[PDB]
Design a protein around this ligand. Structure first.
Ligand SMILES: [Cu+2]
Ligand SMILES: [Cu+2]
Ligand SMILES: [Cu+2]
Ligand SMILES: [Cu+2]
Ligand SMILES: [Cu+2]
Ligand SMILES: [Cu+2]
Lengths: 333, 333, 333
């Protein structure tokens, strides 16, 4: 009886950060209340100043990571302000029924809706917008995110022993398809409706123009590099709502990886690289063992270093010369 | 001694349906006899009336699902009628030796052949045509299907307990590469031989023009939507003989998934989406928990909703408001 | 204390062959010493005589397979002769820290360096060149290979029982992006620096012009076909530093497969085809059961048979008619 369950209100935070939560459930099942406001906005996605009409949950690409426990109820108030011009909705891959909630959450500008669903399966899951007839346009305009449904007793390794993270980050990876003129320059439109049919032609080529983390080239670098310390246990949740990706921590590993993101399965150990299929969220657990800069990439290195799918960690601590050392620094023969 | 084994003749059925079989073997090992007639035919693959010279086993794209048990013998009579104009053969991924049988089954028009092989490994497997020098043209002209080799004691979960399906469907997913003129319109040819070299150029671009289930855009929708009831256990076998796919049941999950299709492995649980590599068949088991329409897709949503890789389930039964409910239907603020 | 450990010097061999090693470690942990000389060279990659400025470790594409045991120390002397014109370095995916060693191994022509790292994780791993700002160009010019870190007690099956191979081969699969003129003919440059910017445009299309095993179309065929005998246990290590692949032994299987290459995980059994993500090495174990020619392919059959990703095994021994036989050879009706 759902009336009788506790309610807790969660205030979301902007990726790659994750809202505060408990790994091990400190309460019984709850109705966990979220609100997201849909924002249609111009976003600059690259160093060149290329613009897209982005379609966002809560103003970000990706949408924020929501976190609950298995057999919690997720209750989302989804608001489509009258400053928007499109139809929106939401499909949670975590949910069961009505196209993941998409059939129940179609909101015109000036409308809102509240959906509740029971999070029966533990894992990380994609959520995305999916209005009938215009689904790939919405998703590849950035209107996707993820939800983590933790087991009530937290994550476990392949032996069933607890794995506890110190830090969690959420990397949303976005393929964009910016339409081009016949010379191959990107096009600009006053409104999203004007972009749409050219958007469909660009998507049908299947090759992205850009592939970015956290909504832009370089978003997770510099002052916005991810951070950790030697000895810290870090979970990286990574989603890709539309295309395969192959994440790799350059300088590290995934010590435990749920490549297709579902925590009732034992993790894969010691991964160099893993395949997160388009329409999936995955999670990798790593304990840093060396300080310094790491590149976290889609290991199609073209996608990473030419199209945008690369971020950095800056890791503090002491250097372990037993794990790695320069015996002879680069020098002339 | 094979003479002494029972023979059973199977009459195949058109995908997405599957011929009658027993999950748990009710006999000892058998020689299971199949006949397929090769048909070269014009097929309309999209709503626009785009045509291809399709190359089929038994008149369908995909070819029918064959079902046997482990350590049965598959005996296929493969007929190339004199109304055809090409060389054909068959490679079973389930089989061992002679390029999966391809080296033994090359039939000119007006020829037939009978191949026998022992199905030593349980799983779902691709079969396809593969004539030396022209293999991708044949496969991507639709000449592929799948065979399921069930364990003799039926499917098992990750704990080794029986999993019994009520219903099984076979989704064959086909990438087509229809040649284009310089404006990007699809080309038509009187005969397959006239299409061939332009076919090779179109394939070499690597990007499909169409990606369809059951041989056409919309084939598994409307009167040909897949069906189930709440509480029904359904196995969806999915193959892709040439390219990766990432199936997703929109509104559901794969409760147990053999993404790369081999039943001696424990299934992956609770999948949102899974990666079936090109040249593979996979299988997902799901118990429906909600009525209504589901979209079963390749979750590159461009491939699904622009190129054709989307089908529907229509599911009957009562709606469970505990699993999902609209708290506040879409309404003005 | 590393001074006190044994040192062993390994002399590498050209792929697809693998240097001599012990599967089960016959010594305690060692510093295993390797030397590689970087060679920039013109390579003809196809039957048409298409040329690329290849960037190699030790003169080969791929670079040689290095083999050590877990908790050995790998010590690589990497030499950039003054006959080269580019900056090079090396990222070992097996290693921990400093971008896999890339941050410590940047050598100008006329320089060398020696890196040591502890091989803490067992598996097969990609290594590649990765100079900051030019990483995908180097990798897709062929400057990648793999390292196998065997468990000290050798490989184990899914039950933890020994798996011992008779033969090991290393297939490096290389996506190349040869720039084209406007008619689609490949371009030639006097020097690598002249190719670079056109190389970047070609890579950004994301679709390879060629995809080859062992550095060229047809490299593992004819006199250079891989070989085995019926009853022989063969491990095929396969890497792809930049794009997904889907290996398949046509006529066979992967009896035990580590698709993402990490030996602390149980292998997947009875695979027809497996997904090795770009930036990964994988390994498949197979016991041949039939003689004859096998095609070992990337099972995007376009990539295999049009772009180059196909090799052969020639297998000797007797034919098993119980596993497969022609009942009726192709003949007229
Ligand atoms: Cu939307
Ligand atoms: Cu989805
Ligand atoms: Cu055929
Ligand atoms: Cu095949
Ligand atoms: Cu280099
Ligand atoms: Cu790498």
């Amino acid at each position: 009886d759902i009336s009788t369950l506790p309610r807790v209100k969660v205030d979301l935070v902007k990726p790659p950060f994750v809202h505060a939560h408990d790994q091990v459930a400190k309460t019984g099942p709850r109705v966990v209340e979220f609100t997201m406001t849909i924002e249609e906005k111009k976003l600059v996605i690259d160093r060149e100043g290329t613009e897209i009409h982005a379609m966002t949950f809560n103003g970000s690409v990706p949408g924020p990571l929501m976190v609950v426990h298995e057999n919690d109820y997720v209750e989302l108030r989804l608001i489509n302000p009258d400053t928007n011009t499109l139809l929106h909705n939401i499909d949670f891959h975590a949910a069961t029924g009505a196209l993941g909630g998409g059939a129940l959450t179609q909101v015109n500008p000036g409308e809102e809706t509240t959906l509740r669903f029971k999070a029966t399966k533990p894992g990380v899951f994609v959520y995305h917008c999916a209005p009938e007839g215009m689904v790939p346009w919405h998703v590849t305009s950035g209107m996707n995110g993820a939800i983590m449904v933790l087991p009530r007793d937290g994550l476990k390794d392949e032996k069933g022993q607890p794995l506890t993270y110190d830090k969690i980050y959420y990397v949303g990876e976005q393929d964009f398809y910016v339409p081009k003129d016949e010379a191959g320059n990107y096009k600009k439109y006053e409104t999203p409706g004007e972009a749409y049919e050219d958007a469909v032609k660009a998507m049908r080529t299947l090759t992205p123009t850009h592939i970015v983390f956290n909504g832009a080239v370089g978003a997770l670098t510099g002052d916005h590099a991810l951070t950790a310390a030697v000895g810290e246990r870090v979970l990286v949740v990574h989603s890709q709502a539309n295309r395969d990706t192959r994440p790799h921590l350059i300088g590290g590993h995934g010590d435990y990886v749920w490549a297709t993101g579902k925590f009732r399965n034992p993790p894969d150990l010691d991964q160099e690289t893993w395949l997160i299929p388009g329409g999936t969220a995955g999670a990798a657990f790593y304990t840093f063992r060396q300080p310094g800069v790491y590149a976290y990439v889609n290991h199609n290195l073209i996608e990473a270093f030419e199209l945008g799918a690369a971020g950095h960690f800056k890791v503090t601590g002491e250097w372990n010369d037993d794990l790695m050392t320069s015996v002879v620094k680069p020098a002339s023969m």
